[PDB]
């Protein structure tokens, strides 16, 4: 459905879900989630046992997410390098969270944004960033993802 059917594994240690999944103790335990990147209107730390990165942002083409790619990638990558699991969630798990995960996949592979979206959709079929987020991902691919790949190599 339009908000998914529970949080979904995208890659080892990387999940996308909706706001309800992000408070679901059974899902968080089953998936060993210890880091939550919360990107939605009212994002703030809630639960115990979880390291948070909170990005207040709207699901609108007027919302800039590119300025949050670097911090999001650092947060996800350092969690995954330690063998831990990160949930990226928005309200629906469809746009804001998906866009940050696409940027991550693009930085840890050779993929452009469309192949990264295909990867996300294989795990979470409802993924569908708005056209504004799509244009931000396209600019990222043509002008900056190569810088981020080099930063990732130099840092880790």
Residue numbers in the entry: -1 to 154
From the primary publication:
DUSP22 is a small phosphatase containing 184 residues, and the sequence contains a catalytic domain as well as an N-terminal myristoylation site. This enzyme is broadly expressed in different tissues and plays important roles in the regulation of signaling pathways, such as inactivating the T cell receptor (TCR) signaling pathway, activating the JNK signaling pathway, and regulating the phosphorylation of focal adhesion kinase (FAK). The phosphatase domain of DUSP22 consists of five twisted β-sheets and six α-helices, and the structural scaffold is similar to that of DUSP3 (VHR), while DUSP22 does not contain an N-terminal α-helix surrounded by the N-loop. In this region, the catalytic activity is facilitated by C88 in the P-loop and D57 in the D-loop, and the hydrogen bonding network is formed by D57 in the D-loop, S93 in the P-loop, and N128 in the N-loop.
The S93 mutants were combined with a second mutation, C88S, to produce proteins for growing better crystals, which improved the resolution (<1.6 Å) and helped to determine the structures. In the crystal structure of C88S/S93A, the overall structure was similar to that of C88S, and the side chains of D57 and N128 also formed a hydrogen bond. A water-mediated hydrogen bonding network was formed among the side chains of D57 and N128, as well as the backbone amide of N128. The position of this water molecule was above the original position of S93 and it did not form a hydrogen bond with the P-loop. A93 in the structure was independent of the water-mediated hydrogen bonding network, and the comparison of B-factor between C88S and C88S/S93A showed that the positional disorder increased on the three loops. The S93A mutation probably resulted in the unstable active site structure and decreased the catalytic efficiency. In the crystal structure, the S93A mutant shows that the P-loop is independent from the interaction of the hydrogen bonding network and the B-factor is increase in the three loops, suggesting that the conformation of the D-loop, P-loop, and N-loop cannot be stabilized. Consistently, the decrease in kcat is observed in the S93A mutant because D57 cannot form a stable interaction with S93.
